[PDB]
Design an enzyme around this catalytic site. Structure first.
Site, short mmCIF file in Angstrom:
data_model
loop_
_atom_site.label_atom_id
_atom_site.label_comp_id
_atom_site.label_asym_id
_atom_site.label_seq_id
_atom_site.Cartn_x
_atom_site.Cartn_y
_atom_site.Cartn_z
N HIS B 41 0.88 -1.21 0.00
CA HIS B 41 0.00 0.00 0.00
C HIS B 41 0.88 1.21 0.00
O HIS B 41 0.48 2.33 -0.41
CB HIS B 41 -0.95 -0.05 1.25
CG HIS B 41 -1.74 1.20 1.44
ND1 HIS B 41 -1.22 2.30 2.12
CD2 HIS B 41 -2.97 1.56 1.01
CE1 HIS B 41 -2.13 3.27 2.11
NE2 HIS B 41 -3.19 2.85 1.45
N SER B 173 4.40 2.41 8.29
CA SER B 173 3.93 1.40 7.39
C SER B 173 5.11 0.94 6.46
O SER B 173 6.04 1.72 6.20
CB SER B 173 2.77 1.88 6.52
OG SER B 173 1.56 1.51 7.11
N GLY B 174 5.13 -0.37 6.20
CA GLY B 174 6.21 -1.01 5.46
C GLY B 174 7.41 -1.42 6.30
O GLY B 174 8.29 -2.12 5.80
C1 LIG Z 1 0.87 2.80 7.58
O1 LIG Z 1 1.57 3.79 7.90
C2 LIG Z 1 -0.53 2.39 8.11
C3 LIG Z 1 -0.46 2.15 9.65
C4 LIG Z 1 0.58 1.06 9.94
C5 LIG Z 1 -0.12 3.50 10.30
C6 LIG Z 1 -1.55 3.42 7.61
C7 LIG Z 1 -1.53 3.48 6.07
N1 LIG Z 1 -2.39 4.53 5.62
S1 LIG Z 1 -1.71 6.08 5.42
C8 LIG Z 1 0.06 6.12 5.34
O2 LIG Z 1 -2.14 6.87 6.66
O3 LIG Z 1 -2.47 6.56 4.22
C9 LIG Z 1 -2.22 2.20 5.63
C10 LIG Z 1 -3.35 2.12 6.70
N2 LIG Z 1 -2.93 3.02 7.74
C11 LIG Z 1 -3.79 3.56 8.68
O4 LIG Z 1 -3.57 4.61 9.30
C12 LIG Z 1 -5.04 3.01 8.78
C13 LIG Z 1 -6.18 3.82 8.90
O5 LIG Z 1 -7.29 3.03 8.91
C14 LIG Z 1 -6.81 1.74 8.74
C15 LIG Z 1 -7.71 0.55 8.68
N3 LIG Z 1 -8.08 0.14 7.35
C16 LIG Z 1 -7.10 -0.69 6.63
C17 LIG Z 1 -7.57 -2.12 6.85
C18 LIG Z 1 -9.05 -1.92 6.58
C19 LIG Z 1 -9.34 -0.64 7.39
N4 LIG Z 1 -5.40 1.62 8.65
#
Ligand SMILES: *C(=O)[C@@H](C(C)C)[C@H]1[C@H](NS(C)(=O)=O)CCN1C(=O)c1coc(CN2CCCC2)n1
Ligand SMILES: *C(=O)[C@@H](C(C)C)[C@H]1[C@H](NS(C)(=O)=O)CCN1C(=O)c1coc(CN2CCCC2)n1
Ligand SMILES: *[C@@H]1O[C@H](CO[C@@H]2O[C@@H](C)[C@@H](O)[C@@H](O)[C@@H]2O)[C@@H](O)[C@H](O)[C@H]1NC(C)=O
Ligand SMILES: *[C@@H]1O[C@H](CO[C@@H]2O[C@@H](C)[C@@H](O)[C@@H](O)[C@@H]2O)[C@@H](O)[C@H](O)[C@H]1NC(C)=O
Ligand SMILES: *[C@@H]1O[C@H](CO[C@@H]2O[C@@H](C)[C@@H](O)[C@@H](O)[C@@H]2O)[C@@H](O)[C@H](O)[C@H]1NC(C)=O
Ligand SMILES: *[C@@H]1O[C@H](CO[C@@H]2O[C@@H](C)[C@@H](O)[C@@H](O)[C@@H]2O)[C@@H](O)[C@H](O)[C@H]1NC(C)=O
Lengths: 218, 218
Positions: B41, B173-174
């Site tokens: 992602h 993330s990653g």
């Molecule tokens: C990565 O940094 C993750 C988390 C490990 C912090 C972040 C990424 N989104 S970002 C960089 O903020 O655009 C990918 C998902 N992350 C989240 O903050 C986040 C917010 O809601 C969710 C739950 N979702 C994903 C699974 C289905 C619902 N994840």
């Protein structure tokens, strides 16, 4: 497609339009009722969740009951190089399965390894840019072309319309190249602009990803 | 990382910062001198041509001669689901080979299918947000965490800090989840906000991908 002809309604029911908002941006090919194939470059810096996979379309400007619309569920890529477009292919699983009918069917692929020789007569297609004097295509277009090796990487299948300025344009990327019935290419890049007369169009070589594709849809 | 501590300099030489024109947006792991892995992602809505893979870093607000910087030459994904983050893993070939040294080392992996049970003790790390006061970390952070199976998909490895609000956040993330010295996880997603104390953090289960990974890295 620059310099082609309108296609007969639903002559290629494996042909797919990829859209974002309400607009076409790339083609693709239905290879299994819940799976399409396209160019990796097409989905690279877009919001894939928003992508609508439209099957059974023919004229994007009109309402079409024949359409079956899906969403992307899984993505598979095998070595795509964003710098030079090597391995420009992606397989997209859909959120559901197409209903195989008159307007929607799975296209067939070439055997792993099957190489194409200068001279073969294929057919390219897409709803891409008619050229730059009027924008995108309303009706699906098609174009007779010929497989060529000159000015082509061994890692591509390339084509050329001999004798005039014609070929694939923006909006045709991800579209299939049909040769003697099988998908031998997916439209990937052009050089010297569209329909230059100087450079052949370049298609990702489907026959080279066959067993990989199969390890996924079978 | 919310509620963690500074890691010791170059304590984790496989730890990678993915940057866009100088700006950290996700972590990654060096799994071969010329390959990193990270979460799919993370590269989904960015121009990958502009992504710099930064090795040997410690403090992002400092000039650092220990660093090695590469670009992405190839991309591999295997069933990444953009709607729910299932199979949130991407392997990235680099445009060269890292020089193995004190500050840069390939990490070790677990064998295919090697699952973890509730209670195993791990260590998460990354350069993400410090909490919601203070921004993104300057110095790499680390955090003691515990594997858990409640409120977790079978297709994820998940962690939780007990007794306080702590966990991964934007920017992490990653990044790798190290357990017993092997990379069992790639930071993927959070629920109820960062460091809710209610929902465990979810990481892509590296072990379920070992065979595919080896086949690319061979
Ligand atoms: C990565 O940094 C993750 C988390 C490990 C912090 C972040 C990424 N989104 S970002 C960089 O903020 O655009 C990918 C998902 N992350 C989240 O903050 C986040 C917010 O809601 C969710 C739950 N979702 C994903 C699974 C289905 C619902 N994840
Ligand atoms: C897709 O539609 C291709 C061509 C088949 C038309 C387009 C895509 N770019 S765009 C601006 O997003 O439509 C990808 C490349 N395309 C080109 O028009 C184009 C411009 O230069 C090139 C050739 N490059 C890229 C690979 C090496 C040289 N292709
Ligand atoms: C599969 O997806 C179809 C399309 O959903 C519509 O477009 C997608 C991209 C999303 O924006 C979605 O919220 C839109 O409504 C659905 O209409 C169809 O029902 C789905 N099929 C299933 C889940 O069986
Ligand atoms: C233009 O091409 C038309 C169709 O070509 C054939 O069918 C497609 C689907 C591919 O499988 C291709 O390999 C085949 O050759 C022909 O009907 C028509 O004759 C062609 N016209 C000219 C002038 O060449
Ligand atoms: C590998 O790439 C390095 C990084 O180059 C920098 O980042 C990439 C994304 C491009 O933006 C590039 O033009 C930037 O300067 C190079 O500096 C390095 O020499 C490359 N090494 C090779 C090709 O062996
Ligand atoms: C915090 O974790 C420290 C390191 O943990 C060990 O190394 C990491 C990288 C993983 O492999 C993990 O599974 C190992 O346990 C411990 O040394 C330290 O004692 C821990 N402290 C507490 C209080 O949990």
């Amino acid at each position: 497609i620059v310099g082609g002809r309108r296609a007969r309604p639903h002559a290629w029911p494996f042909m797919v339009s990829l859209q974002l908002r309400g607009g076409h941006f790339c083609g693709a090919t239905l290879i299994a009722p819940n799976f399409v194939m396209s160019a990796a470059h097409c989905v690279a810096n877009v919001n894939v969740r928003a992508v609508r996979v439209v099957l059974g379309a023919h004229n994007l400007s009109r309402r079409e009951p024949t359409r079956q619309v899906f969403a992307v569920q899984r993505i598979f890529e095998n070595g795509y190089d964003p710098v030079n477009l090597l391995n420009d292919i992606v397989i997209l699983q859909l959120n559901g399965s197409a209903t195989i009918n008159a307007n929607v069917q799975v296209a067939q692929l070439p055997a792993q390894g099957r190489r194409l020789g200068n001279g073969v007569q294929c057919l390219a297609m897409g709803w891409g840019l008619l050229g730059r004097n009027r924008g995108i295509a309303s009706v699906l277009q098609e174009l007779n072309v010929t497989v060529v090796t000159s000015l082509c990487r061994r890692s591509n299948v390339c084509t050329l319309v001999r004798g005039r300025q014609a070929g694939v344009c923006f909006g045709d990327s991800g579209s299939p190249l049909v040769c003697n019935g099988l998908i031998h290419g997916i439209a990937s890049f052009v050089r010297g602009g569209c329909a230059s007369g100087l450079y052949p169009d370049a298609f990702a070589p489907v026959a080279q990803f066959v067993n990989w594709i199969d390890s996924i849809i079978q």
